[PDB]
Design a protein around this nucleic acid. Structure first.
Ligand SMILES: [Mn+2]
Ligand SMILES: [Mn+2]
Ligand code: NA
Ligand code: NA
Length: 322
DNA sequence: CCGACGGCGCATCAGC
DNA sequence: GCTGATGCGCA
DNA sequence: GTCGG
């Protein structure tokens, strides 16, 4: 339908984030691309698009120019600018953000080949992103996600049967592919009110069976690293990004709910929670008073509990597109 | 006309 | 060595 | 850049 337009808006988004370092305009363009992508008609003018929430005056003007000419002047200028195109490109490596990409380009480091020649100028995270540049841009098919889930759940329970692990993200909504693997971890001994190395023991075991191959960051509640499925002669599996988050048990199911999404679903759930006198964040659900003052967090034993408080019928994850 | 727009865990740095 | 700021990635 | 207050 309008792929030409949504591509243009995505490019602009990427330029605003990576080159202009203007994060709010980045999100404005993404939001416009999202709503347009869902519009069930071929857009004929800026005016028509302007009717959509998130599309404003300036975007409507760009849509008119693109419809008239098949291009944006602004974008063509950005494309044949060497500095902008290289800065934008370098941010594709994990650990290189707008600030580093700009620093590198300023000193004439503009390609993966230039990065490889200057590994001495990269921090640890950046060296890993460079090393697995191609693998990290590959999506993960559902069948491998399930194989990964199996290994994680298994090795987790092998450390302590009391651990609870949940793989969240679009995967839990039954997506046929995932960008990375996001695991939420909890344990009885870990509560809001009060063990020292709970997460470490899980990372250790997954390293032990050679599932986890590299670490980007690690602390007491959050691990970000790299993993790989095992191979038997045949093709080695691509390395994948995995995060593991250790969450206190009394906030675990609020966590699962949050990190399951989708983002659109969370928005309309918070929105309905409010109309019913409740406020839901990533951590707790809490009741509101007449002046809008949140009380103590309510006890939560499962996602359903949360749907009960706000008198909402339980939505199975697969129906949480919104 | 105006400021909001997600907020946080971890790595690294800047200033001292 | 200390602390707080910044960069980064990610629901 | 777009929005609601
Ligand atoms: Mn303003
Ligand atoms: Mn307005
Ligand atoms: Na609009
Ligand atoms: Na990056």
């Amino acid at each position: 339908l309008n792929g030409g337009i949504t591509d243009m808006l995505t490019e602009l988004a990427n330029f605003e984030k990576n080159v202009s370092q203007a994060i709010h305009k980045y999100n404005a363009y993404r939001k416009a691309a999202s709503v347009i992508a869902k519009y069930p008609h071929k857009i004929k003018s800026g005016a028509e698009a302007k009717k959509l929430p998130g599309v404003g005056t300036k975007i409507a003007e760009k849509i008119d120019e693109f419809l008239a000419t098949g291009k944006l002047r602004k974008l063509e200028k950005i494309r044949q600018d060497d500095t902008s195109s290289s800065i934008n490109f370098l941010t594709r490596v994990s650990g290189i953000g707008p600030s580093a990409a700009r620093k590198f380009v300023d000193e004439g480091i503009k390609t993966l080949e230039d990065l490889r020649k200057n590994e001495d100028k990269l921090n640890h995270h950046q060296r890993i992103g460079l090393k697995y540049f191609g693998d990290f841009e590959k999506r993960i098919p559902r069948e491998e996600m399930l194989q990964m889930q199996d290994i994680v759940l298994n090795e987790v329970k092998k450390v302590d049967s009391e651990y609870i692990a949940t793989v969240c993200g679009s995967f839990r909504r039954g997506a046929e592919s995932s960008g990375d693997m996001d695991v939420l971890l909890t344990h009885p001994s870990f509560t809001s009110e009060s063990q020292p190395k709970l997460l470490h023991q899980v990372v250790e075991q997954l390293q032990k069976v050679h599932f986890i191959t590299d670490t980007l960051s690690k602390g007491e509640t959050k691990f970000m690293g790299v993993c790989q499925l095992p191979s038997k002669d045949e093709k080695e599996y691509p390395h994948r990004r995995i995060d593991i988050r250790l969450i206190p048990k009394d906030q675990y199911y609020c966590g699962v709910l949050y990190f399951t999404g989708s983002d659109i679903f969370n928005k309309n759930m918070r929105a309905h929670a409010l109309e019913k006198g409740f406020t839901i964040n990533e951590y707790t659900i809490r009741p509101l008073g007449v002046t809008g003052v949140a009380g103590e967090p309510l006890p939560v034993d499962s996602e359903k509990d949360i749907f009960d408080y706000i008198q909402w019928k339980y939505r199975e994850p697969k129906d949480r597109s919104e």
